[PDB]
Design a protein around this ligand. Structure first.
Ligand SMILES: [Cl-]
Ligand SMILES: [Mg+2]
Ligand code: NA
Ligand code: NA
Ligand code: NA
Length: 309
DNA sequence: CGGCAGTACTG
DNA sequence: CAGTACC
DNA sequence: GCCG
């Protein structure tokens, strides 16, 4: 990254727009930050700034300002509210609208939130685990969590396949949470297992809090036994076997890689979701493998580690 | 001008 | 429904 | 914010 002196200050702007709710501008800043953290060179011209995909006139100009004096005028005019809004929206279950409302109501610290805010069930759990959920775990811990879920699943039906996705599958040394995808090659036995699986995992003390318990996805909180353990975010998603390849791809990510794939799909008159690759309500195309998705998009296969965009 | 993804939960 | 979350 |  020959441009960490540009990206460091752009990231302040990106975050300010993100937590203030301007999600599209925040998207544009993040793309430009990704582009600039990947070029071949330092950028030292406005005509070179425009050179790169994701950098336009206004973003060029901002490069051409750090160009000169080593800072961006715009940074000194970010609302004093941004760090508080960032604090509040780092509570799981609170996003930008809730953070702006708390701010408007005069809350300024997590002590204010604890003592005076009305919290949803999810947000009270997010607040209780505030620090823990900002921490990444070693991937060796994601492994133990995956194999905990697998053992409980395969106990009830040994045909069940369980796979940790997310940053774990992309090979990262640390993970923000664990995403366990479950399916069954028989095409039917995947259904209705959550009752049994989740109560099994509660039986250990392993599952400590539920955030979401739907018919096909569970989002919650777990903790391995013993000393020195922290609470970890855990998602479990159950999918029909015919959808396994698209689910693997979607839940392996990264989010920027998926977004680049949806856009490439759109150039070919197709659509790509966690459930399927389809034509324009079109037809679902058969994708038994991740490799088939790439092939039908006319792309060469990328292993999970080269999707970490 | 307007897309930049679609859906599953929660309440 | 609006809001939040998943990659 | 960028881009078509
Ligand atoms: Cl596959
Ligand atoms: Mg994850
Ligand atoms: Na949040
Ligand atoms: Na008060
Ligand atoms: Na997750």
């Amino acid at each position: 990254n020959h441009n960490l002196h540009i990206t460091e200050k752009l990231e302040v702007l990106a975050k300010a727009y993100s937590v203030q709710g301007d999600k599209w501008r925040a998207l544009g800043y993040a793309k430009a930050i990704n582009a600039l953290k990947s070029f071949h060179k330092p950028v030292t011209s406005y005509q070179e700034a425009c050179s790169i995909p994701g950098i336009g006139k206004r973003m060029a100009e901002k490069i051409i300002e750090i160009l000169e004096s080593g800072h961006l005028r715009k940074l000194d005019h970010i609302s004093e509210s941004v760090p508080v809004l960032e604090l509040f929206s780092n509570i799981w279950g609170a996003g930008t609208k809730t953070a702006q409302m708390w701010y408007q109501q005069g809350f300024r610290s997590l002590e204010d939130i604890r003592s005076q805010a009305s919290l949803t069930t999810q947000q009270a759990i997010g607040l209780k685990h505030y620090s823990d959920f900002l921490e990444r775990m070693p991937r060796e811990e994601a492994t133990e969590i995956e194999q905990t879920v697998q053992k409980a699943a395969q106990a009830f039906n040994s045909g069940l396949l369980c796979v940790a996705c997310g940053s774990y599958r992309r090979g990262k040394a640390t993970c923000g949470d664990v995403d366990v995808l479950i399916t069954h090659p028989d095409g039917r036995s995947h259904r209705g297992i959550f009752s049994r699986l989740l109560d099994s995992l509660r039986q250990e003390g392993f599952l400590t809090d539920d955030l979401v318990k739907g018919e096909t996805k569970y989002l919650g909180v777990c903790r391995l036994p013993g000393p020195g353990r922290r609470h970890r975010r855990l998602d479990i998603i159950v999918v029909p076997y015919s959808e396994f390849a698209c689910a693997l791809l979607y839940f392996t990510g990264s989010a920027h890689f998926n977004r680049s794939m949806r856009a490439l799909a759109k150039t070919k008159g197709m659509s790509l979701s966690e459930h399927a690759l389809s034509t324009a309500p079109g037809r679902v195309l058969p994708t038994p493998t991740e490799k088939d998705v790439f092939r039908l998009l006319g792309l060469p296969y990328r292993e999970p580690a080269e999707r970490d965009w």
